[PDB]
């Protein structure tokens, strides 16, 4: 060991080559695999990192561990760079990539000891990667079986399992799933992406949690300014006028200050300043609007006309909310009334129709509910519970659940997780290798066997018998694939994974363990790239 | 102002008594000057001199604490000299050592600084020293 | 791993040899051989080293048989001459005036790079760039006179040759910058336009307001006089070398030059000045006192070209005897990687075209010429007598190292590949060889796997010279 | 169950070490107790040698390596700032108490039981001290008792020959400053001076003050009777 | 560098056990003394658990984490500094054989530890007894335990009353189904700091239902008593203001220098009018206030305080509700701090005062402490802090648990009984927790010099067959009834100790390797 001090080839430093380098690289990769093993899966165990000063940190985040892990080896740093690249591209799953790369390198070294040239191993692994990518593409699916089925409901329950809302998850998960599914839209240029921000959360103390309501419309986080205007106008049919132009008392001139002691001149100046906004308001009243939403606010003086006209004004409205309300109600937010040389709101042209608009009182800040739009597809969640503490906890839990469900939905091409992909690829590549030969069969078989590390590590981290779980998973996948030529399946199904909580084999699609196809594809491709890069090093010189 | 230093400076043995000796000064407009004597009436600069060995725990901890202080105490001078390049036969038994100078004179001689506050010294232990 | 802690991973023989820091004086002959191959051939630095090693092994075996090193060197020289003759006999000649053959060779060379679909433009670009200076029957042509100028922006398809010379710096973007000038003379300036700045101790002493005014007027007058001296020489393009001690062109100097209708380009590095010394055909000016017309060049027009953000100054129509058509190919690309890869690919294409120019024609790759030459030499050596026959047989056996190495590195059966090539060569000639694309022995000629004959010829010659030099060393002594 | 750069005593090792240190300190200060005790010789290394018998001075000047001995010496030193004597008595009592406590602990007696017994015995000893003391009279003619007290104090520190010289000196010096009245006693009223090139027995008492500086003229009177001080 | 297999778990468990064993003897009135030896010649015989855990250096990261946990608990809770470490170490030691000998995965142990934590909390709730948090006599009797036998034993009678009054002033007893239970939101560190007033006696100390300010009137011609006070807080100073960028003053004639004063007067008058627009009675400015500003504010009929630290305003906004506005021009009428009690500045002990109290519940107060000397004041301050921590622990839950290890023994017995019926692999860690709970009574028996085996067996038998109020007597060392002897500890301390120890044990068990990294 420690090959050095060569009697010949007097160079500027030590030099090694061959099996020694291969074994050293394998040992370094195994050392890194030992560090990253416990961080795989939600049931993984924390690891502690200690610096040279005396400080330390504890965390099970594979990316953080790899970033802070001190690796000093020419081949070891390849895995660190691989993990950093995966974090830049994917941002998660680096532990699985590192484990797969280590297993692949170990099996490649085993093949090399079996008189298999490294180039043949690399070619076989690349062929296996291409076949695995093809299989992954063949086993992809979009966002289906999400409405009316327990697919995202289990996701919400899992996210809510660590919060007080877990007790009423059976209903809150349905609420959030429906709210996020309804808001499906093409986004921009047919991107097919759900809204980034949606589903406002409100708090109430009435009834109980099971009575939580989904508002069929939008909600504005503001008040109605003066209390003289009705809080609910035209229940049978209420129209909304959305205007961006400010109704605040205008100035006689931007660069002129009013310093006048004559009552008549003061009255004239005030008349002009209030009359600008009064004309702006009249252009809305003449349109028959019952609720007016102003983004830049409304002054008290101009609210007199609305009060006399029984019109409810709203100040400090959000631009996005008003735009969405107008679009859903068939109207459009008016950016400005200064069309050409005139000043008007185009009466009846930018007024939306709603079934009911009412100022709803809730805990903390109040809001105005706009219900009955022509087409909005959005909703707001009203929280009910025993007390305010439970309401706030449920609000935070709803935020987390909405975030995770939105992340799941935005991925329009996903593949089942929890080891389904790894086992399916293992079976498919095992079948494929029996039809290639040409010195590539061994490499393909070893590559296929390598993917079995991920399910084994997950089972080990779950405190279960990994052998039995992995064998059952392989049997299920083999049974599912064997019936493919028969074009008939009654008890044979695919997409089975490993349940790390109950220690059983379950369908991950229904269970709620899915990951985007890009994540798995990039993970496998980068793991193979790192393994090949490590294998390509057969000479090391240290000057 | 003046925000004079802002960082820990490396010292070589030939300049030890230049960079430490230079505690004995102020600058223009920081004090009174008089007839045939341009020296400020006030005191000089607090200089914190760290005699370090890279192999020792406290030396590594202090390198962190000294630079962290330097980043806030802009007006205080912090310097570091490998202990083995400061004192002929520097003994490991005294390591690390902090000597505080002021106005060219010695103010503190803190020896085996691992006991100057917690073994895992925090900026709280060092800022409590720097205000004494 | 370097002494600085940097880790370098690469399969390039040149970089490996350079970073190996070979300490043995004789082993440095391999680095010298690689450098010579790069200067002449530009490729195959691994093949020359492998051939040198095989010849060294053959020489060791011959010495074990009782053969003196001098006879080994002489017989190796004779065998190398015969092998070069055989190789030249089988070469497929090409004509530099036939752009199609050069374009095909350039495309074949470029196919190994990431940029492949755009090779249809890169290949003719290099072909034309080389042909503009090599024409036909020009013997050896040095490609180092061709400059590759990279600029951020554009895409791969954006490129230009410029038959004259191209500068890498932009014109003055401040007020007064003409940005172009017709009927321009370009000179290389090593000094800077600034007030008196003695290299020794100096200072300005003022005892009155009048003295300060006089000093300011003197400085402005010195700047104006420098600008007027530059103008009087008829230097319409000013190339100021980059400097950090003196302002390249003072604002007042810039205004004076603008009033004098002088194009100003500053922030010029030493490499650009050295390149322009041949591209422009002019001479550097040590100081303003030596600034005259004889030190200036000529050009029909000098202007900054900005089509899609190129902003590159070019000189055309030099029409000077000293100046030569040093074609400066402009490389454009939005990303730095694009321009770097384009530069590397164009360098490889230029090396291939240079190999063709020095010795017209290509030979089949994959070790086919090595196998054929080895077989022919083995057959011929039977007619020789004495130590020469043994040395020729050993040389022929050693020649098969290259195909053996190619087979081993390709993951193929080492012994079987050599036998297959030998059997196939009994019917074909310089047609079948090792190809990584087919993972076996195939018709390299039909696979468009072709390499210049000059590469193999130079490899053989350098290996012979290196083995002769190594064998000729009989003692080592210290000298200080 | 340990950390680097540290050493700890487990089981009863700490008790044994403390007892050994206390016994060592007692043996160090055992020989200098009472008027029949001996004197200790201290060398500072600079050429100065001190021959001292007082426990407080010996403990303060002497360097102590055993941490338990250092603690015992520091605790006993409090006697100087409170009563001015008894340091040797404190050390001997601590040493013997620790000897007996260790002897009982070897038999299985828990240390807390011994501590409780010591506290009870301390309370009983305080009661005995209260019942056993003798009340001194306030008579101004108690000079004989003061002489006896001074002799008792001096015999412990002197060779029994200088006692005859120091006893009357100390008695008179203390009595003169504190008259036969309530008032108060302050030993700062008694000045201490040292003179060289004189016999040890020459020590005398001066009613008033002595000035360091003398005359610088041969014609000045050697003695002045009933002088007016300017 | 790297540790794999059971070795890392063994190392962590050994470090935890080493940390626990040091303080194992720090519990009970019979706690033994310890010797701390520095590398120099100095040493101490301190027996304080916090001091022992603070001055002890540990190299193993797990020991450092345990020490940090204990130090954090020393401030989070008033007691349990050593109990947490001892309990966690005992639990880890008991669980060690299962992880090493029984080959039990750490996840099972962690889950069982969490379930045992829940069960122990339930048992502690079951065994606790209620207390009268409304009757002052019961609170005084309970709090006298942490006040007597100390330097403040002489004034204990009034110390208990002062501490209880302060805690009640900061205590908010509210219960409803709308806002939930506030948990009394008791904060002693920030809004209960004791003000040391030289002179007087402890019996003269009073509790101020608000914030006490030591800033006197900035001008003698200023009101010193307002029956309808209103506080307004500002930051921007009331003086000459320069431009945002470089400002230069150019004056030609000497008499023209009064232009700067005129500009300052104009700006200060405008700012003072803006401040007075909100009908204030006291103006507090964090930055300096010019004399002209003081005069203008006095003209408006209000007091002025300048150069007031942010610490005073932070509590003023709590007890007066005044809103602080950085810029004077941005002051709003709603920022005025109405509902203020008084501005009385009555002097006590030749010291300046400014009372901002009221009959509200701002969850903030000030303690006006008096004493005959500075040392007495400092000692009383420390003892009052301790007593108020104890009172906060008691009042946060109107119940107490028996002391002397009775609670721990009862918890162990009930946990064993429940684990007997679980019928699962997790039963082993439950029994380990139940056995580890016996650490406290073992320590009490050992410190008392009794039989570590027979006494513990008798106590366990009494708990199993008798009541759970039996414990170890501090002085006699025998098994006696805690209620009869008045031995008790707050339930909050026990719950927090158990929860923290079990959570720390779980966290330590989670770590299965220590690797180098920066």
UniProtKB/Swiss-Prot annotation, chain A:
Record GO terms (molecular function): ATP binding; ATP hydrolysis activity; ATP-dependent protein folding chaperone; unfolded protein binding
A GO term from the CC aspect: chaperonin-containing T-complex
Subcellular location: Cytoplasm
TM region(s), chain numbering: none
Cross-referenced InterPro entries: Chap_CCT_alpha (IPR012715), Chaperone_TCP-1 (IPR017998), Chaperonin_TCP-1_CS (IPR002194), Cpn60/GroEL/TCP-1 (IPR002423), GroEL-like_apical_dom_sf (IPR027409), GROEL-like_equatorial_sf (IPR027413), TCP-1-like_intermed_sf (IPR027410), TCP-1_chaperonin (IPR053374)
GO terms of biological process kind: chaperone mediated protein folding independent of cofactor; protein folding
Pfam families found in the cross-reference section: Cpn60_TCP1
CDD domains: TCP1_alpha
The entry's keywords: Acetylation, ATP-binding, Chaperone, Cytoplasm, Nucleotide-binding
Similarity comment text for this entry: Belongs to the TCP-1 chaperonin family.
Subunit structure as annotated in this protein's UniProt entry: Heterooligomeric complex of about 850 to 900 kDa that forms two stacked rings, 12 to 16 nm in diameter.
Function: Molecular chaperone; assists the folding of proteins upon ATP hydrolysis. Known to play a role, in vitro, in the folding of actin and tubulin. In yeast may play a role in mitotic spindle formation.
Designated name of the protein: T-complex protein 1 subunit alpha
Gene name of the encoded protein: TCP1
Curated annotation (Swiss-Prot), chain C:
SUPFAM superfamilies named in the record: GroEL apical domain-like, GroEL equatorial domain-like, GroEL-intermediate domain like
Main location: cytoplasm
Entries under Pfam families matching the protein: Cpn60_TCP1 (PF00118)
Keywords: ATP-binding, Chaperone, Cytoplasm, Nucleotide-binding
GO biological process, alphabetically ordered: chaperone mediated protein folding independent of cofactor; protein folding
InterPro entries according to UniProt: Chap_CCT_delta, Chaperone_TCP-1, Chaperonin_TCP-1_CS, Cpn60/GroEL/TCP-1, GroEL-like_apical_dom_sf, GROEL-like_equatorial_sf, TCP-1-like_intermed_sf, TCP-1_chaperonin
UniProt entry tagged with the keyword ATP-binding: yes
GO molecular function, one term: ATP-dependent protein folding chaperone
Intracellular or extracellular location(s): Cytoplasm
Cytoplasm found in the keyword field: yes
Domain of life of the source: Eukaryota
Entry-linked CDD domains: TCP1_delta
GO annotation, cellular component aspect: chaperonin-containing T-complex
Annotated function: Molecular chaperone; assists the folding of proteins upon ATP hydrolysis. Known to play a role, in vitro, in the folding of actin and tubulin. In yeast may play a role in mitotic spindle formation.
Subunit structure: Heterooligomeric complex of about 850 to 900 kDa that forms two stacked rings, 12 to 16 nm in diameter.
Note: Present with 5530 molecules/cell in log phase SD medium.
Annotated family: Belongs to the TCP-1 chaperonin family.
Name used for this protein in its record: T-complex protein 1 subunit delta
Organism: Saccharomyces cerevisiae (strain ATCC 204508 / S288c) (Baker's yeast)
Gene name of the encoded protein: CCT4
From Swiss-Prot, chain D:
Record key words, sorted: Acetylation, ATP-binding, Chaperone, Cytoplasm, Nucleotide-binding, Phosphoprotein
GO CC terms of this entry: chaperonin-containing T-complex
GO biological process, one term: protein folding
Localization (cell): Cytoplasm
Keyword DNA repair appears in the UniProt entry: no
Top-rank lineage group of the source organism: Eukaryota
Coiled-coil blocks: none
GO molecular function: ATP binding; ATP hydrolysis activity; ATP-dependent protein folding chaperone; unfolded protein binding
Family to which this protein belongs: Belongs to the TCP-1 chaperonin family.
Role: Molecular chaperone; assists the folding of proteins upon ATP hydrolysis. Known to play a role, in vitro, in the folding of actin and tubulin. In yeast may play a role in mitotic spindle formation.
Subunit structure: Heterooligomeric complex of about 850 to 900 kDa that forms two stacked rings, 12 to 16 nm in diameter.
Protein name: T-complex protein 1 subunit zeta
Organism placement in taxonomy: Eukaryota, Fungi, Dikarya, Ascomycota, Saccharomycotina
Gene: CCT6
Parent-protein start and end of this portion: 5 to 234 of 546
UniProtKB/Swiss-Prot annotation, chain E:
A biological-process GO annotation: protein folding
NCBIfam families: chap_CCT_gamma, thermosome_alpha, thermosome_beta
Quaternary structure and partners: Heterooligomeric complex of about 850 to 900 kDa that forms two stacked rings, 12 to 16 nm in diameter.
Family that this chain belongs to: Belongs to the TCP-1 chaperonin family.
Task performed by this protein: Molecular chaperone; assists the folding of proteins upon ATP hydrolysis. Known to play a role, in vitro, in the folding of actin and tubulin. In yeast may play a role in mitotic spindle formation.
MF annotations from Gene Ontology: ATP binding; ATP hydrolysis activity; ATP-dependent protein folding chaperone; unfolded protein binding
Annotated source species: Saccharomyces cerevisiae (strain ATCC 204508 / S288c) (Baker's yeast)
Keyword Calcium (UniProt): no
Annotated S-S bridges: 359-365
Phosphoserine: residues carrying this PTM: 245
Location, primary (coarse class): cytoplasm
Organism superkingdom: Eukaryota
This protein's GO CC annotations: chaperonin-containing T-complex
Gene3D superfamilies documented for this protein: GroEL, GroEL-like equatorial domain, TCP-1-like chaperonin intermediate domain
Localization per Swiss-Prot or TrEMBL: Cytoplasm
Keyword list, A-Z: Acetylation, ATP-binding, Chaperone, Cytoplasm, Disulfide bond, Nucleotide-binding, Phosphoprotein
Identification of the protein by name: T-complex protein 1 subunit gamma
One protein family per Pfam: Cpn60_TCP1
């Amino acid at each position: 060991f420690n090959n050095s001090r060569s009697d010949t080839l007097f160079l500027g430093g030590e030099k090694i080559s061959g099996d020694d380098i291969r074994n050293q690289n394998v040992l370094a990769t195994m050392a890194v695999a030992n560090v990253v093993k416990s961080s795989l899966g939600p049931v993984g165990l924390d690891k502690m990192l200690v610096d040279d000063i005396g400080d330390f940190t504890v965390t099970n985040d594979g990316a953080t561990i790899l970033s802070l892990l001190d690796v000093q080896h020419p081949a070891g740093k390849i895995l660190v760079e691989l993990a950093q690249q995966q974090d830049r591209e994917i941002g998660d799953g680096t532990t699985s990539v590192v484990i797969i790369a280590s297993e692949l390198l170990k099996r490649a070294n085993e093949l090399v000891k079996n008189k298999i040239h490294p180039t043949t191993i690399i070619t076989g692994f690349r062929v296996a990667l291409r076949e695995a990518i093809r299989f992954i593409n063949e086993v992809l699916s979009t966002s289906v079986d999400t409405l009316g089925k327990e697919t995202l409901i289990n996701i919400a329950k899992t996210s809510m399992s660590s919060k007080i809302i877990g007790a009423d998850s059976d209903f809150f998960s349905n609420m959030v799933v429906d709210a996020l599914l309804a808001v499906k839209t093409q986004n921009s240029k047919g991107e097919i992406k759900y809204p980034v921000k949606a589903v406002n959360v409100l708090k109430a103390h009435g009834k109980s949690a099971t009575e939580s309501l989904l508002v069929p419309g939008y909600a504005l986080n503001c008040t109605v300014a003066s209390q003289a205007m009705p809080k609910r106008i035209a229940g049978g049919n209420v129209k909304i006028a959305c205007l961006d132009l400010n109704l605040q008392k205008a100035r006689m001139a931007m660069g002129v200050q009013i310093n006048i002691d004559d009552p008549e001149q003061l009255e004239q100046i005030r008349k002009r300043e209030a009359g600008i906004v009064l004309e702006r308001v009249k252009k809305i009243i003449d349109a028959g609007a019952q609720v007016v939403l102003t983004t830049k606010g409304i002054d008290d003086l101009c609210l007199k006309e609305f009060v006399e006209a029984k019109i409810m004004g709203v100040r400090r409205c959000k631009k996005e909310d008003l735009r969405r309300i107008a679009r859903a109600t068939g109207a459009t937010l008016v950016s400005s009334m200064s069309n050409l040389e005139g000043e008007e709101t185009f009466e009846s042209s930018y007024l939306g129709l709603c079934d009911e608009v009412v100022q709803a009182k809730f805990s903390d800040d109040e809001c105005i509910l706009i219900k009955g739009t022509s087409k909005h597809s959005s909703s707001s969640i009203i929280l009910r519970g025993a007390n305010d503490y439970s309401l706030d906890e449920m609000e935070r839990s709803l935020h987390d659940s909405l975030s995770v469900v939105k992340r799941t939905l935005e991925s329009g091409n996903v593949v089942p997780g929890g080891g389904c992909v790894e086992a399916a690829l293992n079976i498919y590549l095992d079948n494929f290798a029996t039809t290639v030969g040409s010195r590539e069969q061994l490499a393909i078989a070893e590559f296929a066997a390598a993917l079995l590390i991920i399910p084994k590590t997950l089972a080990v981290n779950a405190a279960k018998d990994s052998s039995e779980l992995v064998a059952k998973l392989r049997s299920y996948h083999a049974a599912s694939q064997m019936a493919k030529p028969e074009d008939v399946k009654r008890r044979s199904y695919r997409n089975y994974g490993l349940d790390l909580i109950r220690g059983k084999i379950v369908d991950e699609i229904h269970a709620g363990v899915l990951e985007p196809t890009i994540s798995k594809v990039k993970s496998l491709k980068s793991a193979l790239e790192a393994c090949v890069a490590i294998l390509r090093i057969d000479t090391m010189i240290t000057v | 102002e003046r925000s004079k230093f802002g960082e820990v400076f490396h010292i070589n043995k030939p300049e030890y008594n230049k960079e430490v000796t230079l505690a004995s000064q102020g600058k223009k407009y920081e004090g009174a000057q008089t007839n045939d004597n341009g020296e400020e009436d006030d005191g000089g600069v607090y200089v914190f001199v760290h005699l370090s060995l890279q192999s020792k725990l406290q030396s590594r901890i202090l390198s962190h604490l000294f630079q962290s202080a330097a980043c806030k105490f802009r007006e205080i001078k912090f310097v570091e000299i490998p202990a083995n390049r400061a004192i002929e036969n520097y003994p490991e038994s005294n390591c690390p050592t902090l000597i505080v100078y002021y106005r060219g004179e010695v103010i503190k001689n803190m020896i085996t600084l691992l006991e100057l506050g917690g073994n895992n010294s925090k900026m709280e232990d060092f800022e409590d020293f720097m205000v004494k | 791993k370097t002494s600085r802690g940097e880790i370098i991973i690469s399969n390039d023989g040149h970089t490996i040899l350079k970073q190996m820091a070979i300490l043995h004086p004789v082993a440095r002959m391999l680095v010298e051989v690689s450098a010579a191959q790069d200067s002449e051939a530009g490729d195959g630095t691994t093949s020359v080293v492998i051939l040198t090693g095989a010849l060294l092994g053959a020489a060791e075996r011959l010495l074990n048989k009782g053969i003196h090193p001098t006879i080994i060197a002489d017989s190796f020289q004779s065998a190398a001459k015969r092998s070069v003759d055989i190789l030249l006999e089988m070469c497929h000649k090409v004509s530099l005036s036939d752009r199609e053959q050069l374009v095909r060779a350039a495309s074949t060379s470029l196919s190994s790079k990431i940029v492949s679909q755009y090779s249809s433009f890169l290949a003719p670009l290099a072909v034309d760039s080389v042909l503009k200076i090599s024409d036909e029957n020009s013997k050896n042509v040095d490609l180092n006179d061709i400059r590759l100028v990279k600029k951020v922006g554009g895409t791969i398809d954006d490129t230009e040759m410029i038959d004259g010379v191209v500068l890498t710096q932009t014109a003055i973007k401040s007020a007064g910058g003409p940005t172009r000038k017709e009927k321009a003379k370009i000179g290389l300036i090593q000094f800077q336009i600034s007030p008196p700045k003695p290299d020794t101790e100096n200072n300005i002493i003022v005892n009155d307001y009048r003295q300060m005014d006089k000093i300011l007027k003197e400085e402005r007058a010195y700047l104006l006089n420098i600008c007027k001296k530059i103008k009087k020489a008829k230097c319409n393009v000013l190339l100021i070398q980059k400097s950090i001690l003196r302002d390249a062109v003072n604002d007042l100097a810039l205004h004076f030059l603008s009033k004098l209708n002088i194009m100003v380009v500053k922030d010029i590095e030493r490499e650009e000045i050295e390149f322009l010394s041949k591209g422009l055909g002019c001479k550097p000016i040590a100081d303003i006192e030596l600034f005259t017309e004889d030190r200036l060049g000529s050009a029909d027009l000098v202007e900054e070209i900005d089509s899609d953000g190129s902003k590159i100054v070019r000189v055309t129509g030099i029409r000077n005897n000293n100046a030569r058509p040093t074609v400066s190919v402009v490389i454009r690309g939005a990303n730095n990687m694009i321009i770097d890869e384009t530069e590397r690919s164009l360098h490889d294409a230029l090396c291939v075209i240079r190999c063709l120019v020095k010795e017209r024609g290509l030979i089949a790759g994959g070790g086919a010429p090595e196998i054929e030459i080895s077989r022919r030499l083995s057959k011929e050596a039977r007619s020789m007598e004495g130590v020469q026959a043994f040395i020729w047989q050993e040389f022929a056996s050693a020649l098969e190292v290259i195909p053996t190495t190619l087979a081993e590195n390709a993951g193929l059966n080492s012994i079987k590949v050599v036998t297959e090539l030998r059997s196939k060569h009994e019917n074909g000639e310089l047609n079948d060889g090792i190809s990584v694309r087919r993972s076996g022995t195939t018709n390299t000629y039909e696979e468009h796997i072709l390499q210049p004959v000059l590469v193999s010829t130079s490899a053989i010659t350098l290996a012979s010279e290196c083995v002769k030099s190594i064998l000729r060393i009989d003692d080592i002594a210290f000298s200080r | 169950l340990l950390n680097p750069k540290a050493e700890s005593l487990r089981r009863d090792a700490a008790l044994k070490v403390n007892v050994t240190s206390a016994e060592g300190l007692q043996s160090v200060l055992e020989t200098n107790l009472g008027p029949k005790g001996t004197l200790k010789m201290l060398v500072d290394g600079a050429g100065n040698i001190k021959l001292t018998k007082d426990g407080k001075v010996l403990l303060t000047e002497m360097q102590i390596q055993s941490p338990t001995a250092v603690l015992i010496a520091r605790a006993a030193a409090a006697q100087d700032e409170i009563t001015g004597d008894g340091t040797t008595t404190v050390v001997c009592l601590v040493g013997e108490l620790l000897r007996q406590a260790h002897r009982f602990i070897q038999e299985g007696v828990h240390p807390r039981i011994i501590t409780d017994g010591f506290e009870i015995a301390r309370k009983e000893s305080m009661k005995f001290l209260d019942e056993f003391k003798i009340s001194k009279t306030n008579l101004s003619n108690d000079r004989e008792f003061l002489l006896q007290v001074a002799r008792s104090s001096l015999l412990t520190k002197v060779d029994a020959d200088l006692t005859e010289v120091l006893t009357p000196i100390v008695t008179d010096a203390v009595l003169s400053v504190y008259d036969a009245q309530a008032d108060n006693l302050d030993l700062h009223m008694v000045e201490i001076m040292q003179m060289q090139h004189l016999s040890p027995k020459d020590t005398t008492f001066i009613k008033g003050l002595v000035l360091d500086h003398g005359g610088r003229h041969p014609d000045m009177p050697t003695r002045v009777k009933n002088a007016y001080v300017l | 560098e790297r540790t794999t297999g059971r070795q890392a778990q063994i190392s962590n468990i050994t470090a935890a056990k080493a940390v626990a064993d040091v303080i194992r003897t720090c519990l009970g009135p019979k706690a033994m003394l310890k010797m701390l030896l520095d590398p120099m010649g100095g040493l101490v015989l301190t027996n304080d658990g916090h001091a022992i855990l603070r001055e002890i250096d540990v190299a193993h990261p797990a020991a450092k984490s345990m020490l940090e946990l204990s130090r954090t608990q020393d401030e989070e809770v008033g007691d349990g500094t050593t109990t947490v470490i001892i309990l966690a170490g005992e639990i880890l030691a008991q669980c060690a054989p299962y992880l090493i000998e029984k080959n039990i995965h750490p996840v099972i142990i962690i889950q069982a530890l969490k379930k045992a934590l829940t069960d122990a909390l339930e048992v502690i709730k079951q065994v606790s007894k209620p207390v009268d948090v409304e009757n002052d006599a019961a609170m005084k009797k309970l709090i006298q335990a942490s006040i007597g036998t100390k330097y403040v034993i002489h004034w204990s009678e009034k110390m208990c009353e002062l501490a209880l009054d302060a805690v009640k002033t900061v205590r908010k007893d509210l219960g409803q189904t709308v806002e939930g239970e506030p948990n009394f939101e008791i904060d002693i560190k920030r809004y209960v700091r004791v003000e040391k007033i030289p002179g007087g006696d402890v019996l003269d100390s009073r509790v101020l239902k608000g914030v006490l300010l030591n800033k006197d009137v900035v001008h003698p011609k200023m009101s010193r008593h307002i029956e309808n006070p209103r506080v307004v807080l500002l930051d921007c100073p009331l003086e000459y203001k320069k431009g945002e960028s470089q400002t230069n003053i150019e004056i030609e004639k000497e008499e023209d220098w009064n232009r700067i004063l005129q500009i300052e007067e104009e700006q200060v008058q405008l700012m003072c009018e803006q401040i007075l627009a909100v009908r204030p009675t006291l103006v507090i400015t964090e930055k300096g206030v010019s004399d002209l500003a003081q005069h203008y504010l006095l003209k408006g009929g209000c007091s002025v305080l300048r150069r007031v630290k942010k610490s005073d305003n932070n509590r003023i906004a709590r007890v007066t509700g005044a809103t602080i506005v950085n810029r004077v021009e941005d002051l709003k009428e709603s920022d005025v701090g109405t509902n203020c009690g008084l501005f009385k500045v009555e002097m006590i002990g030749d010291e300046y005062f400014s009372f901002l109290d009221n009959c509200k519940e701002p969850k903030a107060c000030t303690i006006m402490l008096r004493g005959g000397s500075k040392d007495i004041l400092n000692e009383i301050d420390r003892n009052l802090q301790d007593a108020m921590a104890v009172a906060r622990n008691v009042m946060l839950s109107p119940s107490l648990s028996p002391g002397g290890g009775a609670t721990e023994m009862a918890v162990s017995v009930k946990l064993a009984e429940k684990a007997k019926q679980l019928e699962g692999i997790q039963q082993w860690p439950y029994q380990a927790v139940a056995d580890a709970m016996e650490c406290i009574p073992r320590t009490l028996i050992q410190n008392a010099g009794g039989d570590p085996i027979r006494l513990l067996s008798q106590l366990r038998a009494k708990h199993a067959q008798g009541n759970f109020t039996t414990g170890i007597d501090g002085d006699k060392g025998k098994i006696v009834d805690m209620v009869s002897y008045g031995i008790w500890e707050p339930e909050v301390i026990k719950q927090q100790s158990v929860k923290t120890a079990i959570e720390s044990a779980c966290l330590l068990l989670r770590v299965d390797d220590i690797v180098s990294g920066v």
